[PDB]
């Protein structure tokens, strides 16, 4: 499957829910801005609206799941994925040492709306640590952020 699967749709819904923090079924400029700040970007008002406008098929000013899914499923050009992942690493690696610690991971995840347990943080670190050196580096993060 290059094709859209039920599993993929369910994963995209889980991602949608991370944006739609009030659970009302639509992502507002306020909700999009909050997630972007958690990931280290402070978008302007017009950037948020201009971005929403490009995918806002029904013209209501906010993004519903159908619109989000269409965006995520699309066969695309210039997705900015590699560069966005590179940039996102910076909020994880807050001390700039090139590695994401357990504490660092826990901090970003809390900002994204989690309350992860110690076991989950430790498991997330261990899973990413494919070279087995005890730590999580940039290339390891990249593999997790395309899993």
């Amino acid at each position: 499957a290059d094709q859209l699967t039920e599993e993929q749709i369910a994963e995209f819904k889980e991602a949608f829910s991370l944006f739609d923090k009030d659970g009302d079924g639509t992502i507002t400029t306020k909700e999009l801005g909050t997630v972007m700040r958690s990931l280290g970007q402070n978008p302007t008002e017009a950037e948020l609206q201009d971005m929403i406008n490009e995918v806002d098929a029904d013209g209501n000013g906010t993004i519903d799941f159908p619109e989000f899914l269409t965006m995520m499923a699309r066969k695309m050009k210039d997705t900015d994925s590699e560069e966005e992942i590179r940039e996102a690493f910076r909020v994880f690696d807050k001390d700039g040492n090139g590695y994401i610690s357990a504490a660092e991971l826990r901090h970003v995840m809390t900002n994204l709306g989690e309350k992860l347990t110690d076991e989950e943080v430790d498991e997330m670190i261990r899973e990413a640590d494919i070279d087995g050196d005890g730590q999580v580096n940039y290339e390891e993060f990249v593999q997790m952020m395309t899993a």
């Binding site: 994963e11 991370l18 990931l39 971005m51 929403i52 997705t79 994925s81 966005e84 992860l116 952020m145």
Partner: peptide
């Protein structure tokens, strides 16, 4: 944990596509 990484990655991907 794997699904949590995937959710995070999909959020970043969504911001890229939106950008």
């Amino acid at each position: 944990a794997r699904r949590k990484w995937q959710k995070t990655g999909h959020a970043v991907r969504a911001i890229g596509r939106l950008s």
